[PDB]
From Swiss-Prot:
Keywords: Phosphoprotein, Transcription, Transcription regulation. Anti-proliferative protein; the function is mediated by association with deadenylase subunits of the CCR4-NOT complex. Activates mRNA deadenylation in a CNOT6 and CNOT7-dependent manner. In vitro can inhibit deadenylase activity of CNOT7 and CNOT8. Involved in cell cycle regulation. Could be involved in the growth arrest and differentiation of the neuronal precursors. Modulates transcription regulation mediated by ESR1. Involved in mitochondrial depolarization and neurite outgrowth. It comes from the Eukaryota. Changing residue 69 to A: Abolishes interaction with CNOT7 and CNOT8. The chain holds residues 7 to 127 of 158 of the full protein. Changing residue 47 to A: Impairs interaction with CNOT7 and CNOT8. Belongs to the BTG family. The keyword Transmembrane does not apply. The lineage of its organism: Eukaryota, Metazoa, Chordata, Craniata, Vertebrata. The keyword Transcription regulation applies. This is Protein BTG2.
Amino acid sequence: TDMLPEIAAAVGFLSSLLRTRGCVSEQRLKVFSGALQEALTEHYKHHWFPEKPSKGSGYRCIRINHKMDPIISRVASQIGLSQPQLHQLLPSELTLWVDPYEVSYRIGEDGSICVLYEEAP
């Protein structure tokens, strides 16, 4: 019931966007992926409750508005991506919900809710 699959799906989504929209070597994309996985599992450790998936949902949520998510920012820094470049490469107004058994996202305040990952408990 551990948090890796949901977090790796989230991270794979953000990586894919860097790969697609950017010019980032796989070496860097791999550093970013592992580092973001570790960052987020540290971040979610005490805020993960498999039996009540919406509990802690707001805390775990990854937002990109006019400020970049601070964990994305610092991990991305680790591979030499500045926040302004992230802003350019990643969608505007992105919301990424990373909950037990379900990863989902929205591009834009009024975009569709897409499911990245769903699995049965």
